[PDB]
Every structure is written in structure tokens, then in C-alpha cells.
């Protein structure tokens, strides 16, 4: 994973996201959703999803939430106050903690001012405390600003390492982007049916076609402008739409 003071930032993009494999995996110790309850994720579409990743203590997972305070949310990783995504977290004692202490997981414990939301700060300047210019030298009136979790496998829970992933769905002003997978029934050839083909809503009997649709078209229309053919996505095979039987 990545440190807590330099978290990562992956920009998930156009694709088919299935938050159900996440939501029901039962391996996550914490799955909170804020802008949007979890079950309705596989039914919405946004412009971008960002995923941030890092590693913290066990009992600092309560500062990864909108409107908190503490050494983590103050200056390591700050979440805006109208967050939209979800926060996922699971214990990882066996991977990240090693006998003798894993001193490779640091965090920042001194900063001039709390972070702006989603702001990041990897500098390593000596936190000048005393009015006396530090001059880049340690000693009194000057602290190094980074400390390290010394993780060890015989630590009580709440001191063992937890891995955290923060998904943040954003919606700029584009034309569209990633959304959840869609269902798919079957072709009941010869049965007045109520159909919806990615937007086209109608009624009628569906039948195998023999018309040759171009290499980019979707459906077909007739003179006087009524939909009379469609193309199925799952397969891409011409199909005619015959009105029902009335008289």
C-alpha cells in the first residue's frame, strides 16, 4: 500500500464498475457510504471515480469521515464537508506488521495549518518551533515533522495496521462516464411483449430480421416515422417490431 502522509490517487475512468462485489464481500471491516447508500451504486453513473489508498492505525479509521479532527484528518488526509463517495477499510495485521517493528509506515504530526480537502503535502522541512531560526538543524526549537508507526504483530487491536480505500465519485460537467452493469433478459420471439432497448420503449412482437443495418446504426424506422426495427446489444442482430393484434 501507500503511506498515510503521501496517499495514492488512482483515477478510475470509463468502464463498468460493479460495487456489488465490493459491498457483499464481507471481508471489509468498515464500509460507509455518505453521499449515496451502498445498494444504489450499481444503478447510477458519474463522470469520474477517484480511489485513494493508504494505511493507518486501527482506531484512526474514525477520522476518515466528513467533519472530523485529529492528527490524521488535520494534516494527513482531509475529506470535504459534502463528501459523496464511500470509505472502505479492512484489517491487515498479517501483511504490514513484522516482528521487530515495521518502521516504513510514517505519518505527519506537525504542520502549520490544517489541510484543504483533498490536499497533499510531501515536504520534509524542519518544523521550526522556537523563534530562533532552525537553519535546517535539529535540536531545540525544531522538530522533524514525520513519525513512524512501529507496527508489531503482538499489538492489541486498535494498534494493528488497517488498510483504507476512499472512493470519491465526482460529477463535473461532461457528457457521461462509468456506470454500473445492466441486466438482460431473453428474446421471446412471437409474443406481444413490453420492451425497452437502451431507451427505446415500446410494445409488440419481436421477430428475427433479414435487413442489413449499417456498421454504426441502431434501429430502423418507416415512412410516417414509426420504429419498426431495432438492434440488440448483447448480440447485435437485426430484429423487426410488428404491432400487436387488434381489430
Amino acid at each position, epitope marked *: 500500500f501507500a503511506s498515510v502522509y503521501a496517499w495514492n490517487r488512482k483515477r478510475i475512468s470509463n468502464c463498468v464498475a460493479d460495487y456489488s462485489v465490493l459491498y457483499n464481500s464481507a471481508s471489509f471491516s468498515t464500509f460507509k457510504c455518505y453521499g449515496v447508500s451502498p445498494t444504489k451504486l450499481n444503478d447510477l453513473c458519474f463522470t469520474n471515480v477517484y480511489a485513494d489508498s493508504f494505511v493507518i492505525r486501527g482506531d484512526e479509521v474514525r477520522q476518515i469521515a466528513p467533519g472530523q*479532527t*485529529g*492528527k490524521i484528518a*488535520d*494534516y494527513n488526509y482531509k475529506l470535504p464537508d459534502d463528501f459523496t463517495g464511500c470509505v472502505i477499510a479492512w484489517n491487515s495485521n498479517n501483511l504490514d506488521s513484522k516482528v521487530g*517493528g515495521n518502521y516504513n509506515y510514517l505519518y505527519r504530526l*506537525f*504542520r*502549520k*495549518s*490544517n489541510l484543504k480537502p483533498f490536499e497533499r503535502d510531501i515536504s520534509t522541512e524542519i*518544523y*521550526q*518551533a*522556537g*523563534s*530562533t531560526p532552525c537553519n535546517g538543524v535539529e535540536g*531545540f*526549537n525544531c*522538530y522533524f515533522p514525520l*513519525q513512524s508507526y*512501529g*507496527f*508489531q504483530p*503482538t*499489538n*492489541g*487491536v486498535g*494498534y494493528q495496521p488497517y488498510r483504507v480505500v476512499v472512493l470519491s465519485f465526482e460529477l463535473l460537467h461532461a457528457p457521461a462516464t462509468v456506470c454500473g452493469p445492466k441486466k438482460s433478459t431473453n428474446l421471446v420471439k412471437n409474443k406481444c411483449v413490453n420492451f425497452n432497448f437502451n431507451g427505446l420503449t415500446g410494445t409488440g412482437v419481436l421477430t428475427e430480421s433479414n435487413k442489413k443495418f449499417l456498421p454504426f446504426q441502431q434501429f430502423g424506422r418507416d415512412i410516417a416515422d414509426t420504429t419498426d426495427a431495432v438492434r440488440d446489444p448483447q448480440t447485435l442482430e437485426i430484429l423487426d417490431i410488428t404491432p400487436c393484434s387488434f381489430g
Partner: antibody
Amino acid sequence: EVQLVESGGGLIQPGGSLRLSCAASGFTVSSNYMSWVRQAPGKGLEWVSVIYPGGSTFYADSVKGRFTISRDNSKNTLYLQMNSLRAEDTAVYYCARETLAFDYWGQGTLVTVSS
Amino acid sequence: DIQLTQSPSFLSASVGDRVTITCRASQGISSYLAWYQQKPGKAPKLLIYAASTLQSGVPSRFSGSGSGTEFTLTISSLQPEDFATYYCQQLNSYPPAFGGGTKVEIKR
């Protein structure tokens, strides 16, 4: 180097109040973890409150609420305005500059008798 | 669950000797705490850092021994002038737990 001195202790009754001034004799109370440590006489210590270099409170368990900490950087003073003392705190108060551990913490008293 | 640290108090010794004080930790703590010297009627002074890296401005008589739990301090070659109590703490976590304190007597 740093010689923190404090003032403000005395005697009062319940529902009273009192401001304590951890006078930062010494430098840069603007950017240091500071805290209040309390002990009743004949007893072990106990922790009260804490300020962050950036502003946060996190009060203790029993003194949750009813108790306020602040700083003043231009005056180099920490301010502890309390009120409604259950008189059950009659104690000897310390203010210490947490520097990755603690140390550097003066002394100062108080009593909250009902007379 | 908070940690409750313990100590075998009320020590008694003579000068120039070895004495050893342990500090229980009734939960899995890591290895970051600290010892203090509390002379009577005064302010504490921390001796042992967040483990055993004794903080500066102290003599060569203290030897903090750290671990996962069951931390232990040891004074070797005593000197008549350490009449006070010794506490444990537990840095890192905000509300921290303190020890019980061990007074140490000096035989004559």
C-alpha cells in the same frame, strides 16, 4: 531553555469558575502540543485537555464539556477557562509542553472546597 | 477498553546497588511509553523516552528495557538523592493511561 510558569490557582465553591494562564515563559506556544495534567494529593496523575498546533480540543472523560482550553500566540499564553467545578477536582494542576513525549511542564495549585 | 498499567511499588534499598522496576500493560501495547521521576512536592521529569532511548540531561544510572508488553526500568549503582515516585505513561494515544507509582526507600 524553556521555563513555563503558570498562575491562577486559588479557592472556590461548586458552580464556580476560574481561568488558568499557562504563561509560556519560553518560546513558540503557537506551534506545540500543549496539555493539562492533574493529580489529586496522594494520588497518581490524570490527563485533562490538549490543544493542537492548528486548533482542536479532545477533552478528557469526566471533564467532558464544562471545561475550555485555548491559547494566545501573540501573548504566548495558554488559557484554561473552567466552570461548574464538581469540587471533586481539588487538585494540583500542571501544564506541560508535549514534545513527542512531554517534559517541560511547570506547576500550579487549586482547591474547590464547599466553604 | 483502556490500558491499565501496573507496578510493584514500595521499594527499599541501599546506595550503589541494583534495583529493577517493571510496568505491566494489561492490553497489547506496542513499545512506546515513558518513565518519570517525581520528587515529592515537585514537577515530574521524564527519563526514559518512548522505549529506552533515555532523554538527554540525565546520568548513566537508568536503563529502560522495552518490549511488546511488560516494560521494565532498572537503576544500577544508586545515589542518595532519588527520593521520589516513578510512573509509567503511554504516548501516541490522546487520552493516555498512567501508572500507579513506586516510592523507593533508602536503607541506612
